[PDB]
Amino acid sequence: SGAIYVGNYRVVNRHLATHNDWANLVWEDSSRDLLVSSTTAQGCDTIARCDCQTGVYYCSSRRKHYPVSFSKPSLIFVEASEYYPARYQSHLMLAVGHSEPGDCGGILRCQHGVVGIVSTGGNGLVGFADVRDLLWLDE
Ligand SMILES: CSc1ccccc1CC(=O)N1CCC[C@H](C(N)=O)C1
Ligand SMILES: [Zn+2]
């Protein structure tokens, strides 16, 4: 679990979106595992606008933040699950690090701000859905 709050927006994993998120939908993309919904309050998270490949992520399954080197956003094959069939997920960044299913939503941050959220994992790897290209989150 975990979301990003920026202005009148709530950014969550699409596979964890609530009824409220769907009834207040702004944008969703299954291929990126993202869903953005509207909020009545003003979000204060800053989105990074950069091409950093190092940062820190929050891991709920260890209650700890971990420093990571992560790849550039790209199409990565993700195995079938209760939420999606086996497919390529786009805008995905991989790092070597611990993750478990309940970890989805934890924020990845660099010195410039919020980079993306935990979305995949398996075998000592963690995958982050990038949000830096979503320039409309600030306007
Ligand atoms: C942190 S997720 C994790 C971690 C360790 C092991 C297994 C997982 C589950 C995982 O990778 N997925 C299930 C939820 C939907 C994800 C997707 N974006 O398609 C894929
Ligand atoms: Zn950065």
Short mmCIF file of C-alpha atoms and ligand atoms in Angstrom, two decimals:
data_model
loop_
_atom_site.label_atom_id
_atom_site.label_comp_id
_atom_site.label_asym_id
_atom_site.label_seq_id
_atom_site.Cartn_x
_atom_site.Cartn_y
_atom_site.Cartn_z
CA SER A 1 0.00 0.00 0.00
CA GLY A 2 0.94 3.68 -0.47
CA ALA A 3 0.08 6.64 -2.69
CA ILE A 4 1.63 9.94 -4.05
CA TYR A 5 -0.23 13.19 -3.23
CA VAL A 6 0.55 16.15 -5.58
CA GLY A 7 -1.90 19.09 -5.84
CA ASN A 8 -5.40 17.70 -6.47
CA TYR A 9 -4.03 14.27 -7.41
CA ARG A 10 -3.64 10.84 -5.83
CA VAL A 11 -1.26 8.49 -7.72
CA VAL A 12 -1.67 4.80 -6.84
CA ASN A 13 -0.87 1.30 -8.26
CA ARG A 14 -3.71 0.55 -10.69
CA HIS A 15 -4.10 -3.01 -9.28
CA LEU A 16 -4.75 -1.50 -5.76
CA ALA A 17 -7.08 1.40 -6.81
CA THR A 18 -10.24 1.79 -4.65
CA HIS A 19 -13.95 2.39 -5.69
CA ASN A 20 -13.35 6.09 -4.84
CA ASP A 21 -10.26 6.20 -7.09
CA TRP A 22 -12.37 4.78 -9.99
CA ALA A 23 -15.37 7.12 -9.27
CA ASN A 24 -12.90 10.13 -9.20
CA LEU A 25 -10.69 8.85 -12.11
CA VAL A 26 -8.46 11.31 -13.98
CA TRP A 27 -6.17 8.82 -15.88
CA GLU A 28 -5.25 5.08 -15.70
CA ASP A 29 -2.82 2.88 -17.73
CA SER A 30 -2.80 -0.97 -17.17
CA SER A 31 0.46 -1.26 -19.11
CA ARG A 32 2.17 1.01 -16.51
CA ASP A 33 0.19 -0.27 -13.48
CA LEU A 34 -0.79 3.39 -12.70
CA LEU A 35 -4.03 5.12 -11.81
CA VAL A 36 -4.47 8.79 -10.92
CA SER A 37 -7.60 10.02 -9.06
CA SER A 38 -8.80 13.50 -7.90
CA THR A 39 -8.77 14.70 -4.23
CA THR A 40 -10.56 17.43 -2.22
CA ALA A 41 -7.33 18.36 -0.34
CA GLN A 42 -3.97 19.84 -1.62
CA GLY A 43 -1.08 17.32 -1.96
CA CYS A 44 2.39 18.55 -1.00
CA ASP A 45 4.70 15.83 -2.52
CA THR A 46 7.19 17.23 -5.11
CA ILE A 47 7.66 15.17 -8.31
CA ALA A 48 11.26 14.82 -9.56
CA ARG A 49 11.93 16.08 -13.14
CA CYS A 50 15.30 14.47 -13.86
CA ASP A 51 17.16 11.32 -15.17
CA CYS A 52 18.60 10.10 -11.80
CA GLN A 53 19.52 6.42 -11.52
CA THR A 54 20.16 6.44 -7.70
CA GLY A 55 17.70 7.11 -4.86
CA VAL A 56 15.95 5.73 -1.71
CA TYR A 57 12.80 3.59 -1.45
CA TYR A 58 10.54 2.65 1.46
CA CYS A 59 10.08 -1.13 2.06
CA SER A 60 6.96 -1.86 4.27
CA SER A 61 8.00 -5.55 4.62
CA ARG A 62 11.15 -4.44 6.52
CA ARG A 63 9.88 -1.00 7.84
CA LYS A 64 13.10 0.45 6.37
CA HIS A 65 14.29 2.77 3.57
CA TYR A 66 16.98 1.35 1.25
CA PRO A 67 19.41 3.17 -1.05
CA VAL A 68 19.24 1.81 -4.70
CA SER A 69 20.77 2.14 -8.18
CA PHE A 70 17.88 1.65 -10.61
CA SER A 71 17.57 1.31 -14.36
CA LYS A 72 16.09 3.80 -16.90
CA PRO A 73 12.30 3.43 -17.49
CA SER A 74 11.52 0.68 -20.04
CA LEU A 75 9.29 -2.33 -21.16
CA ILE A 76 9.86 -5.25 -18.79
CA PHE A 77 8.10 -8.61 -18.92
CA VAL A 78 6.06 -9.18 -15.74
CA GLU A 79 4.60 -12.57 -14.90
CA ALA A 80 0.86 -13.36 -14.69
CA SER A 81 -0.91 -12.49 -11.37
CA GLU A 82 -4.45 -12.10 -9.95
CA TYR A 83 -4.51 -8.56 -11.51
CA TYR A 84 -2.97 -8.96 -14.98
CA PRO A 85 -2.06 -11.71 -17.48
CA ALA A 86 1.69 -12.21 -18.34
CA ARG A 87 2.76 -9.00 -20.22
CA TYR A 88 5.37 -6.22 -20.77
CA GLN A 89 4.91 -3.40 -18.25
CA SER A 90 6.20 -0.08 -19.63
CA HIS A 91 7.96 2.77 -17.76
CA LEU A 92 9.40 0.21 -15.32
CA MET A 93 12.73 0.64 -13.46
CA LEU A 94 14.55 -2.25 -11.78
CA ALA A 95 16.86 -2.18 -8.74
CA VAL A 96 18.49 -4.96 -6.71
CA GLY A 97 16.66 -4.94 -3.36
CA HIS A 98 14.11 -6.62 -1.13
CA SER A 99 10.33 -6.43 -1.97
CA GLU A 100 7.11 -8.47 -1.22
CA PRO A 101 3.51 -7.95 -2.67
CA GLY A 102 2.40 -5.63 0.20
CA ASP A 103 5.35 -3.36 -0.71
CA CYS A 104 3.63 -1.94 -3.83
CA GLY A 105 2.97 1.80 -3.34
CA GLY A 106 6.13 2.58 -1.34
CA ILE A 107 7.77 5.70 -2.71
CA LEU A 108 11.18 5.87 -4.53
CA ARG A 109 12.83 9.31 -4.04
CA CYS A 110 15.99 11.07 -5.32
CA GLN A 111 17.38 14.56 -4.27
CA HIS A 112 14.90 16.15 -6.76
CA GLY A 113 11.77 14.51 -5.34
CA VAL A 114 9.38 11.61 -5.89
CA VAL A 115 10.58 9.41 -8.78
CA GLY A 116 7.98 6.60 -8.75
CA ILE A 117 6.30 3.88 -6.64
CA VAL A 118 7.05 0.12 -5.93
CA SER A 119 5.04 -2.00 -8.48
CA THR A 120 6.89 -5.30 -9.15
CA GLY A 121 9.49 -7.56 -7.47
CA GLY A 122 10.88 -11.05 -7.19
CA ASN A 123 14.28 -12.81 -6.53
CA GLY A 124 16.18 -9.96 -4.86
CA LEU A 125 14.84 -7.42 -7.43
CA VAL A 126 12.35 -4.55 -6.91
CA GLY A 127 10.53 -2.69 -9.80
CA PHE A 128 9.29 0.94 -9.67
CA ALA A 129 6.61 2.53 -11.86
CA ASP A 130 8.20 5.84 -12.99
CA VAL A 131 6.09 9.09 -12.67
CA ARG A 132 8.67 11.72 -13.79
CA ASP A 133 7.33 11.96 -17.33
CA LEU A 134 3.78 12.81 -16.12
CA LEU A 135 4.34 16.56 -16.46
CA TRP A 136 0.55 17.34 -15.95
CA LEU A 137 0.79 16.26 -12.28
CA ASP A 138 2.12 19.84 -11.57
CA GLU A 139 -0.44 21.82 -13.64
C1 LIG B 1 6.56 -5.66 -4.84
S1 LIG B 1 5.57 -6.74 -5.87
C2 LIG B 1 6.26 -8.34 -5.58
C3 LIG B 1 7.42 -8.50 -4.82
C4 LIG B 1 7.96 -9.76 -4.64
C5 LIG B 1 7.33 -10.86 -5.17
C6 LIG B 1 6.17 -10.71 -5.91
C7 LIG B 1 5.61 -9.45 -6.13
C8 LIG B 1 4.31 -9.36 -6.89
C9 LIG B 1 4.44 -8.69 -8.25
O1 LIG B 1 5.54 -8.47 -8.74
N1 LIG B 1 3.29 -8.39 -8.89
C10 LIG B 1 1.95 -8.68 -8.34
C11 LIG B 1 1.08 -7.44 -8.33
C12 LIG B 1 1.05 -6.80 -9.72
C13 LIG B 1 2.46 -6.49 -10.26
C14 LIG B 1 2.36 -5.84 -11.62
N2 LIG B 1 2.64 -4.54 -11.67
O2 LIG B 1 1.94 -6.46 -12.60
C15 LIG B 1 3.28 -7.79 -10.23
ZN ZN B 2 16.55 13.20 -9.48
#
